[PDB]
Amino acid sequence: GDVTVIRDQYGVPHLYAKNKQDLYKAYGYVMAKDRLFQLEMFRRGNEGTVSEVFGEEYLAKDEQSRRDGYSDEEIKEMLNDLEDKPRAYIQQFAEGISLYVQEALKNPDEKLSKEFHDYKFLPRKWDATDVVRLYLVSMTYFMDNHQELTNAEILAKLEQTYGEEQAEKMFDDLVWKNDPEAPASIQAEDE
Amino acid sequence: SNAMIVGEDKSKTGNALLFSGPQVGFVAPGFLYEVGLHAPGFDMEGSGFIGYPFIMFGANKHIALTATAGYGNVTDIFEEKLHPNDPTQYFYKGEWREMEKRTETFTVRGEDGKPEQVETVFYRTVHGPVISIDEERGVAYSKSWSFRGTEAQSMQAYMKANWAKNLKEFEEAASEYTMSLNWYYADKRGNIAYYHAGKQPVRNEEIDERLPTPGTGEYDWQGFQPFEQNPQAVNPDNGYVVNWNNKPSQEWRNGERSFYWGKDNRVQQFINGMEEREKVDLEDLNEINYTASFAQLRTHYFKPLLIEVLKENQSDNESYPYLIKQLEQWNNLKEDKNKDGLYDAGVAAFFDKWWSITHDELFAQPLGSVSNLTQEITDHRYGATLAYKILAGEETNYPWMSKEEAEQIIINSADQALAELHEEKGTKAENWRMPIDTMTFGETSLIGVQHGYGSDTPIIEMNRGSENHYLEMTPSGPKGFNITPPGQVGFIHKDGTVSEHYEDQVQMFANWEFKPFLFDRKEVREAAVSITDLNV
Numbered sequence: 191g192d193v194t195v196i197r198d199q200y201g202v203p204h205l206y207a208k209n210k211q212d213l214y215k216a217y218g219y220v221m222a223k224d225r226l227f228q229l230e231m232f233r234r235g236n237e238g239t240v241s242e243v244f245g246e247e248y249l250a251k252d253e254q255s256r257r258d259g260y261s262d263e264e265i266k267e268m269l270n271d272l273e274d275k276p277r278a279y280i281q282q283f284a285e286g287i288s289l290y291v292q293e294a295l296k297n298p299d300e301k302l303s304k305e306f307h308d309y310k311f312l313p314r315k316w317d318a319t320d321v322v323r324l325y326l327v328s329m330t331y332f333m334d335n336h337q338e339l340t341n342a343e344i345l346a347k348l349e350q351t352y353g354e355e356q357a358e359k360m361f362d363d364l365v366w367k368n369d370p371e372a373p374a375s376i377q378a379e380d381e
Numbered sequence: 382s383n384a385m386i387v388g389e390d391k392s393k394t395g396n397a398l399l400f401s402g403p404q405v406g407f408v409a410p411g412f413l414y415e416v417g418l419h420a421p422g423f424d425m426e427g428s429g430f431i432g433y434p435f436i437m438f439g440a441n442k443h444i445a446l447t448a449t450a451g452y453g454n455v456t457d458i459f460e461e462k463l464h465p466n467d468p469t470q471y472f473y474k475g476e477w478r479e480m481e482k483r484t485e486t487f488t489v490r491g492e493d494g495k496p497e498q499v500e501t502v503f504y505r506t507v508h509g510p511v512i513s514i515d516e517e518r519g520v521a522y523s524k525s526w527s528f529r530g531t532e533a534q535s536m537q538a539y540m541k542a543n544w545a546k547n548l549k550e551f552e553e554a555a556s557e558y559t560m561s562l563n564w565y566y567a568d569k570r571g572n573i574a575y576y577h578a579g580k581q582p583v584r585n586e587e588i589d590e591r592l593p594t595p596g597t598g599e600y601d602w603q604g605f606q607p608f609e610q611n612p613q614a615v616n617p618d619n620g621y622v623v624n625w626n627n628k629p630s631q632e633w634r635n636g637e638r639s640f641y642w643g644k645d646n647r648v649q650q651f652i653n654g655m656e657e658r659e660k661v662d663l664e665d666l667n668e669i670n671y672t673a674s675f676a677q678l679r680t681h682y683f684k685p686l687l688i689e690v691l692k693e694n695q696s697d698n699e700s701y702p703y704l705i706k707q708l709e710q711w712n713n714l715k716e717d718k719n720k721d722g723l724y725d726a727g728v729a730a731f732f733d734k735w736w737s738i739t740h741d742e743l744f745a746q747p748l749g750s751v752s753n754l755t756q757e758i759t760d761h762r763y764g765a766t767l768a769y770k771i772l773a774g775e776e777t778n779y780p781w782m783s784k785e786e787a788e789q790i791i792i793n794s795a796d797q798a799l800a801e802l803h804e805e806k807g808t809k810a811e812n813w814r815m816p817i818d819t820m821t822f823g824e825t826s827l828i829g830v831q832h833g834y835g836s837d838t839p840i841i842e843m844n845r846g847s848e849n850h851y852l853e854m855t856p857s858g859p860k861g862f863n864i865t866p867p868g869q870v871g872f873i874h875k876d877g878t879v880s881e882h883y884e885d886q887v888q889m890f891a892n893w894e895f896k897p898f899l900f901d902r903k904e905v906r907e908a909a910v911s912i913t914d915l916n917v
């Protein structure tokens with residue numbers, strides 16, 4: 191399996207492969223080659239191991255990440271339930287990252303970015319679960335929220351101040367059940 | 382994050398258009414990773430979030446796609462009733478239950494480099510991870526995600542969207558994406574399509590979805606809605622779909638974050654641009670993006686109200702005629718066209734102050750007891766719907782104040798803004814021009830974990846995507862232009878000098894310059910700097 195990589199004037203890699211299995215491996219490799227230290231810290235974020243390199247300031251962050259996260263075995267079950275081709279591509283993606291790691295470890299002072307030298311730690315091998323963790327660490331941020339608790343505190347204090355009747359009216363104005371005048375991306379009448 | 386899709390009827394060239402603008406911060410190395418993927422039966426160019434094995438903002442041979450966070454109601458908090466003598470037991474379906482416990486050991490690098498160890502225990506209930514245990518109040522709060530355990534399924538769905546070639550295949554992938562994202566589609570036939578994806582729980586009818594759900598079992602999720610009920614449209618007869626994290630459709634709800642979706646919503650900047658142009662090209666979309674990036678968002682609803690109130694009390698204050706005319710001539714932007722480091726319209730400084738004073742006069746007293754929590758609601762990033770309704774005399778649930786009291790706040794706030802400007806800057810709008818706010822590509826992203834060294838190069842602040850694609854699906858394939866700041870490569874040499882492609886797109890970003898979208902091999906070869914082989 192062989193893949194051609196073309197870098198343009200901005201350094202963007204354009205991969206030309208003979209199949210998707212090789213394509214996705216080169217995918218992970220060029221991304222690792224360009225952003226290894228960034229990938230490592232994103233994985234450490236999800237795994238809650240940032241404090242291993244950056245110290246006790248990240249302890250609470252690590253604890254929160256593990257609190258709400260999945261075990262290595264739970265992610266394996268998620269992978270097993272995928273279709274054959276996508277699972278294999280995620281695996282090839284991980285092996286491509288792992289490939290540049292091997293390459294970088296054999297020549298650290300040329301192929302490891304200054305951050306590794308400054309903070310005195312190394313990159314590590316990657317498996318398919320680690321690739322899922324790169325997705326969990328960021329995509330969850332746009333879905334997760336505890337605003338139900340903040341609203342309960344708002345309503346509780348408003349009730350203590352204004353009584354139940356007025357507090358509910360104020361709450362209805364702050365956090366409405368619906369605003370029918372809110373601009374919407376689509377309209378049923380437009381079909 | 383913002384997005385636009387334009388059908389052939391709305392497109393000057395007759396080809397469907399797509400615009401991407403994910404807002405994931407400005408960091409170095411960047412949050413995005415641009416790539417070209419080409420194998421037999423699959424050609425795709427664009428960018429996705431770092432670490433993702435798929436393109437989210439780009440186009441393949443047949444379709445272009447992008448996404449914005451849906452902000453659908455996919456997270457619920459359950460209030461568990463605790464055992465009076467054991468905070469690790471909760472009552473559920475008629476029986477006391479034990480929380481699932483597990484121990485985790487954290488290794489912490491000491492100030493002296495020696496590794497210390499801390500051990501902690503975390504808890505889950507039937508509803509999800511426990512995020513808080515309140516022993517005094519006898520309750521704990523657990524966190525249920527409608528997508529719990531299906532994140533890998535979502536990844537697979539995004540991969541199928543990369544491989545999709547017609548819309549039937551794109552819709553199927555969208556039906557499989559379990560997390561809350563808006564998905565946008567455009568193909569070479571001229572079609573556009575929109576899907577507000579994400580698993581929607583079927584909730585108990587008695588529950589107020591703005592507040593935590595009791596966890597004793599009577600109010601559990603009863604299933605999930607079929608994807609057919611998620612908001613979605615193909616080829617709306619207005620010929621476009623725009624989104625800036627706003628409401629998907631008039632029938633849709635999202636519970637505790639409803640205050641994101643009000644009458645006053647920032648997507649108005651994109652709607653205006655589309656409604657004021659009969660047909661659009663990629664250059665029009667860039668004009669709209671520019672407007673949205675520099676718009677003072679409160680102008681849309683509040684400036685006309687301010688102007689009217691000033692005219693009605695014009696004879697009461699001698700500065701109002703000049704003030705009225707400066708507001709009317711102002712294009713509502715905070716921009717720096719001549720690049721002198723000053724916002725071009727000085728009256729924008731008056732309007733910033735007027736809004737700030739007005740908002741505080743509306744809510745500082747009535748909400749003083751909760752202002753730390755309600756300020757993000759009443760002065761929200763997307764709009765100030767309640768404030769507008771009060772000031773405009775529109776119906777509210779609570780009688781905050783009369784129309785007359787609101788008029789007086791508008792006048793008082795205007796006089797105070799003028800007074801402060803007269804005391805501090807001068808009598809002419811040009812004296813009021815404020816220095817531009819600037820930003821740098823920092824070292825820590827939304828994931829809250831330092832991932833690099835960032836950058837020191839400042840650029841003008843912009844309410845804008847971390848990258849932009851402008852795509853036109855011509856019959857011969859996708860074409861256009863994009864920008865992916867700060868640069869492709871995050872490598873820093875041991876010498877301390879950054880890669881040549883670490884930051885070489887920052888000024889293009891700041892100066893509204895773009896590089897060509899590269900897709901077919903002829904144009905990729907012409908752009909080639911280096912060619913290289915690879916293995917398995």
Ligand SMILES: [Ca+2]
Pocket residue numbers: 320
């Ligand atoms: Ca691991």
Ligand SMILES: [Ca+2]
Pocket residue numbers: 389394395396397570571
């Ligand atoms: Ca056409």
Ligand SMILES: [Ca+2]
Pocket residue numbers: 338454455456457458590636637
């Ligand atoms: Ca909820």
Ligand SMILES: [Ca+2]
Pocket residue numbers: 389570571
């Ligand atoms: Ca057509």
Ligand SMILES: [Ca+2]
Pocket residue numbers: 664665
């Ligand atoms: Ca034009």
Ligand SMILES: [Ca+2]
Pocket residue numbers: 716717718719720721722723724725
């Ligand atoms: Ca200027």
